[PDB]
Symmetry: C2
Subunit: 193 residues, 2 copies
């Protein structure tokens, strides 16, 4: 059998993506993983309690009707994963957390080459970020139970449920770009550091 | 509204159309005419003298169908480069990473890209997501793309068609405009009159 998950470094970095109140609009259709916030909160608490590196990514927009524009309620972090004073928050304007943000240079300057990723949506900004992270040479564990996405019509006109959308993105990501795993296994690997 | 190029120099970017992808190990594919659609685009680009780049995938992994110096590494004959044409080799999924692609495009003002190749959901999608987020105007010629069957993370066997359809839906609007090669070829004919 495969060996249990083990971190190669003593400083894996938790990267939480776009966990902002905007995504709670019921108009964005059904989501999967109703306890994703709780899974992310558990990772965040563990990282904080161990003094491990962590970065919150959040999405900004200049579009005047965007729920992500400054001052709008949707732009705020979800309270379950609200940053603390002094924690690193990096804002982005496109899907990938690397583009226009200086994230790669910051990670490399600090030796943070192993990433634990969670957030929303699995298939949009999470996937965009993870594909680039893997191809840039980062070792990525995607905590899939801390991720969620939404129902989406495919190009042939078939409604795919959020679960289906999630499952197809994970299948495209695993092996090729990252190791897909669960938060419980990640938390267990911390104890081995 | 029917497709219209914003520039007079859209660039054709053909991704990883190498004999490797014919290996039955990849599993079943969709879009059996993708090669012919790509050949039609390539011939039109050549005939019109428009910008074009072939992206080639290279591996140092001993088991890969794209391992250099064996037949799978060669371009498919339908879309084989010709002398003087730009070929950029990559070692990861995205055509931007570890190559000079972005800088080359920007130095020449090649901000509008027409993309086709293989696989829709792997290297094509990785390249297109980055292109769109980098600010390139991308038209994805979906009939010139193909992919393979894959089992989703919940055990459901998806056909190549279904995989393709899901990637196109994720790509369209957010990262690119999905369209057909016939659309694209018609739009080339309208450039001159828009000058």
């Amino acid at each position: 059998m495969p060996a249990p998950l083990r971190f190669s470094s003593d400083k894996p970095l938790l990267l939480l993506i776009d966990m902002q109140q905007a995504v709670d609009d019921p108009s964005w259709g059904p989501r999967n993983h109703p306890q994703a916030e709780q899974a992310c909160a558990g990772l965040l608490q563990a990282w904080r309690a161990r003094g491990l590196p962590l970065i919150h990514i959040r999405h900004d927009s200049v579009e005047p009707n965007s729920t992500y524009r400054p001052g709008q309620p949707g732009h705020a972090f979800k309270p379950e994963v609200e940053p603390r004073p002094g924690e690193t928050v990096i804002a982005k304007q496109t899907n990938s957390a690397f583009i226009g943000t200086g994230l790669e240079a910051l990670l490399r300057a600090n030796g943070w080459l192993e990433l634990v990723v969670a957030g929303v949506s699995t298939s949009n900004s999470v996937e965009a970020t993870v594909r680039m992270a893997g191809n840039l040479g980062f070792a990525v564990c995607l905590a899939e139970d801390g991720c969620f996405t939404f129902d989406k019509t495919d190009w042939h006109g078939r409604r795919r449920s959020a679960d289906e959308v999630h499952a197809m993105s994970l299948a495209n990501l695993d092996g090729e770009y990252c190791r897909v795993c669960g938060s419980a296994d990640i938390l267990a690997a911390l104890g081995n550091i």
